[PDB]
């Protein structure tokens, strides 16, 4: 909330009309800039295949709730409502005994390979959005903190590949 970077997002006893988090599917997305996936992809020209977005619920054991994780292919812009987000590829994540949800962004592309970076977004380097919505509010008993933290991770899927060794735009560490 102070514009500081953290490995998780917050959810509570309410269902916002907007997504809790939004990630553009590009190995260039700033949100994944420091993941091993992005670190490796920065040294290759193109990718192909599945992407796995892993969410780990860290709230209390007494906290329940459901999220709707959606992947919207491009062409009609970012989904503005839950009604729109559900119109695309999605999975409902129900909290419980198992803590995490392994979500796959299917490789849907006009081209066999996609660029890992770009100057300006093109139909071969930007591929839509992954948004997670609160389907039902996080629900819990008394004596439980109102905010639950969900860890967010990314990696290439089973059929993910990279190709064409290159050097990424240099920068000064800091």
């Amino acid at each position: 909330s102070n514009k500081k970077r953290i490995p998780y997002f917050s959810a509570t006893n309410s269902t916002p009309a907007t997504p809790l988090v939004t990630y553009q599917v590009t190995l260039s997305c700033s949100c994944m800039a420091n993941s091993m996936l992005a670190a490796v992809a920065r040294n290759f020209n193109q990718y192909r295949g599945s992407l796995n977005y892993l969410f780990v619920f860290t709230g209390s054991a007494m906290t329940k709730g459901k999220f709707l994780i959606s992947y919207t292919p491009p062409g009609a812009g970012e989904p503005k409502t839950l009604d729109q987000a559900m119109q695309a590829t999605y999975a409902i994540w129900d909290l419980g005994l198992n803590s995490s949800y392994n979500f796959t962004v299917p490789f849907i592309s006009p081209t066999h390979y996609r660029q890992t970076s770009y100057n300006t977004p093109t139909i071969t380097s930007v591929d839509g959005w992954l948004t997670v919505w609160q389907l039902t509010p996080l629900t819990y008993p008394l004596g439980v903190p109102n905010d639950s933290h969900i860890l967010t991770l990314v990696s290439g899927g089973d059929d993910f590949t990279l190709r064409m060794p290159v050097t990424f735009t240099k920068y000064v560490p800091q």
């Binding site: 020209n45 066999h112 380097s125």
Partner: protein, 252 residues
């Protein structure tokens, strides 16, 4: 004999159909697309006034940049882009003469004769120094759509272009023959490249320059070291698709 062109196809006849004659064909295969395009044709020119051991910085001088976009189609600085991009039209370098040279870079032989809509091939590039002063140059090849990495030197007195894992070439000395040649594979994310026009936009809000396809090239060549260098393209294992009209020629 009679036929009906409205069918959209009529027979290929020889003299024997209507007259007392014989077929007269002789074997010949120099018309094969692969053979025809498998030869080097001038396709670009490059110029640099920076030494090898310095930081590469994009520059333009009388319509010549120190880097090029690898595509047979016209390319040039477009609307003040940092590096050259694919153009949609050719312009005279001179504002008055209305005669070439053009300010745009391209393989004139390809533009003037590309009777197909899409093509696929590997690219053999030849880079030659325009004078005989001993060459001392470094060239960096960047795959189609990859980061240009126009960064600072990380170490003093070194060619920034060589500060990469991208394929690069370094030629210098009295034993060299002032040229460089090599072949790169097709690297575009597109299955086949549009040879003339691309009837669409390249990004999702349709704000790009209509007519230019996204990532329709073979990468880029950045150069540092003193001199003017001419570039040639040779299309390896060339394959073309969908016949289409050739450039119009003024009536004699």
């Amino acid at each position: 004999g009679v036929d009906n062109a409205e069918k959209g196809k009529v027979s290929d006849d020889n003299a024997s159909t209507d007259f007392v004659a014989e077929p007269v064909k002789l074997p010949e295969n120099q018309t094969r697309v692969s053979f025809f395009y498998d030869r080097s044709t001038l396709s670009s020119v490059l110029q640099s006034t920076s030494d090898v051991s310095s930081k590469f910085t994009p520059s333009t001088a009388k319509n010549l940049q120190n880097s090029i976009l690898l595509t047979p189609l016209p390319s040039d600085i477009v609307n003040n882009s940092v590096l050259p991009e694919q153009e949609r039209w050719i312009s005279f370098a001179s504002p008055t003469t209305q005669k070439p040279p053009y300010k745009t870079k391209q393989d004139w032989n390809f533009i003037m004769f590309s009777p197909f809509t899409y093509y696929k091939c590997d690219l053999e590039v030849t880079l030659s120094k325009n004078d005989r002063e001993t060459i001392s140059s470094v060239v960096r090849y960047v795959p189609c759509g990859a980061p240009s990495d126009l960064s600072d030197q990380t170490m003093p007195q070194t060619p920034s272009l060589a500060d990469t894992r991208d394929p690069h070439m370094w030629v210098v000395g009295q034993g060299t023959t002032n040229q460089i040649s090599f072949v790169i594979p097709y690297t575009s994310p597109l299955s086949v490249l549009p040879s003339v026009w691309f009837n669409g936009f390249s990004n999702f809000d349709n704000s790009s320059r209509f007519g230019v396809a996204p990532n329709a090239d073979f990468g880029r060549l950045l150069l540092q070291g003193q001199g003017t260098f001419s570039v040639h393209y040779r299309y390896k294992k060339m394959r073309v698709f969908c016949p289409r009209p050739t450039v119009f020629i003024p009536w004699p």
